[PDB]
């Protein structure tokens, strides 16, 4: 959210597989859901978070 | 665009009226006034009011007689796109005579009954009935 | 789209004073500024079609403003285009 480094706060917006959880489920707001996903995509790149559960 | 205020007046009226709106306001001007005058003096509005100084504000009080509005129809006639001018003998009469036509003459904005009696003619600003 | 420092500099080089911000001459000059700046952005790239639209908008804006001044104070007009360096 505020940050991609927040893997702790972040890891509760994704499933087992690692899939981003839709706003509809988490009930988040709009503006932030984006901030969220961005911060997630960031973390995935920096190997701080699995794109996949294929490991 | 602003381009034709006088229609905007005629209209802000026409509309508010149809919206059984008590009053109605708008940017003022020498001209708006002279017509608001004839409009009151001929008893199509209660009374006007210009409340400002640097940015004047015409305000008209509307009327309603039965349930209806008093102004049953108000149209432009001359306009920037197409000016109308009539000579005295060629002045128009609304609803056969009932209701009136605002005409501006070399002796000021007056009705058709008026300008006719004054023996002259000018630009026929609008019709009202 | 141009700096605060830069834009300031020119208000302060064209108007009565910083604050006389909307002075004809000033607008023109801080337009003229951005247009020229830009010439190099579009030098490279060139296919930045969208941004190009904004630039023309700058030119035609400036064009209308220049037209205004000239009608108003011709004296001020001429000084301008000299000092700004255009209207070959």
């Amino acid at each position: 959210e505020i940050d991609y480094k927040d893997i702790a706060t972040l890891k509760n917006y994704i499933t087992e597989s690692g899939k981003i959880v839709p706003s509809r489920i988490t009930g988040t707001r709009a503006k932030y859901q984006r901030q969220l996903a961005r911060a997630i995509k960031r973390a995935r790149y920096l190997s701080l978070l699995p794109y996949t559960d294929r490991h | 665009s602003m381009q034709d205020p006088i229609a905007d007046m005629l209209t802000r009226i026409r509309n508010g009226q149809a919206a059984n709106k008590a009053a109605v306001t708008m940017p003022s001007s020498k001209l708006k006034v002279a017509i608001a005058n004839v409009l009151k003096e001929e008893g199509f509005i209660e009374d006007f009011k210009v409340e400002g100084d640097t940015k004047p504000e015409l305000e008209l009080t509307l009327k309603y007689f039965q349930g209806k509005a008093v102004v049953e129809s108000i149209q432009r006639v001359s306009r920037p796109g197409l000016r109308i001018y009539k000579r005295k003998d060629e002045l128009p009469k609304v609803m056969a005579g009932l209701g009136i036509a605002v005409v501006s003459t070399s002796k000021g904005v007056m009705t058709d009954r008026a300008a006719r009696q004054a023996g002259l003619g000018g630009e026929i600003i609008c019709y009202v009935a | 789209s141009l700096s605060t420092e830069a834009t300031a500099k020119i208000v302060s080089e064209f108007g009565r004073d910083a604050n006389d911000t909307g002075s004809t001459e000033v607008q023109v000059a801080l337009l003229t500024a951005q247009i020229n700046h830009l010439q190099g952005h579009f030098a490279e790239h060139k296919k930045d079609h969208h941004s190009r639209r904004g630039l023309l908008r700058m030119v035609s804006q400036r064009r209308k403003l220049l037209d205004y001044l000239k009608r108003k104070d011709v004296a001020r007009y001429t000084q301008l285009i000299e000092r700004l360096g255009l209207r070959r």
Binding site: T15, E16, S17, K19, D53 | - | -
Partner: protein, 51 residues
């Protein structure tokens, strides 16, 4: 995806797969490209999902 089911039981217990993959993004990607037509699809997925 994964079930590391433990001790006492023999049943599959993988109702997991009806929560994401399989016919999900699979019946999806299987065939006609789509392109601008999903738009027409999903434009009914809201007209519906209004009520």
């Amino acid at each position: 995806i994964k079930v590391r089911e433990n001790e006492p039981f023999d049943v599959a217990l993988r109702r997991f797969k009806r929560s994401c993959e399989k016919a999900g993004v699979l019946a999806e990607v299987r065939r006609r490209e789509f392109y601008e037509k999903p738009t027409t699809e999903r434009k009914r997925a809201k007209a519906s999902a209004v009520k």
